[PDB]
Amino acid sequence: HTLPANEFRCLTPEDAAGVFEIEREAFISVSGNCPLNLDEVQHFLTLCPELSLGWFVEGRLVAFIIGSLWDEERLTQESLALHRPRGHSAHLHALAVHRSFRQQGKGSVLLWRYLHHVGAQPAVRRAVLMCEDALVPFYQRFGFHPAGPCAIVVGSLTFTEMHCSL
Numbered sequence: 001h002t003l004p005a006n007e008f009r010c011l012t013p014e015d016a017a018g019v020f021e022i023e024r025e026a027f028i029s030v031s032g033n034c035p036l037n038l039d040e041v042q043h044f045l046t047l048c049p050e051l052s053l054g055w056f057v058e059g060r061l062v063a064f065i066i067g068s069l070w071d072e073e074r075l076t077q078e079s080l081a082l083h084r085p086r087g088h089s090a091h092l093h094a095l096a097v098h099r100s101f102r103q104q105g106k107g108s109v110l111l112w113r114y115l116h117h118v119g120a121q122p123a124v125r126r127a128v129l130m131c132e133d134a135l136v137p138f139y140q141r142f143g144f145h146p147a148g149p150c151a152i153v154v155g156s157l158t159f160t161e162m163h164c165s166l
């Protein structure tokens, strides 16, 4: 009977298509590649949906974060496709906001809600991610500290690894 004006919930594999569509415009149209392809989105939403969060407006996904657990201090090429159940780090594989909903605090609201959501899970002691140099200041606003160049390479893109103690 009703499509909520705003809904925040963990994602399930049924949201994979919506997530990938956002990635097409958000990442692929810019650099030619993206953090998670359809199969990879489904992988993490199957293994660890509790490590994801999505913002729905009138029944449509407008922002998401997909993560998994990592168990090493630094991110590695292999960590891109792995979920370490025994790990203590919430690895945010991707964060994006639908192009028609940016610049209005949605990314910041979703990120803070995410940090509190996963930080609330006794097992998660830290959050890690990588971003392009221009987003470093942004993440620092949430308690993330620049942790040097990330070892992970994607095409010609280089990233700074960011760590947040929870």
Ligand SMILES: CC(C)(COP(=O)(O)OP(=O)(O)OC[C@H]1O[C@@H](n2cnc3c(N)ncnc32)[C@H](O)[C@@H]1OP(=O)(O)O)[C@@H](O)C(=O)NCCC(=O)NCCSCC(=O)NCCc1c[nH]c2ccccc12
Residues within 6 Å of the ligand: 026, 027, 031, 033, 034, 035, 036, 092, 093, 094, 095, 096, 097, 098, 101, 102, 103, 104, 105, 106, 107, 108, 109, 129, 130, 131, 132, 134, 135, 138, 154, 157
């Ligand atoms: C960034 C985000 C989520 C903010 O949302 P919003 O617009 O709703 O945000 P707010 O309104 O809450 O705040 C906006 C703030 O963010 C700043 N900002 C936004 N875009 C900026 C930019 N390009 N450069 C500098 N500052 C910027 C604004 O300047 C502004 O600050 P000020 O107004 O105070 O200066 C939203 O713009 C978005 O979804 N963008 C596209 C996807 C993306 O990059 N995800 C983050 C990748 S970083 C995490 C990640 O996913 N890593 C994977 C790394 C990765 C793996 N494989 C790949 C393949 C290709 C590419 C990347 C990868």
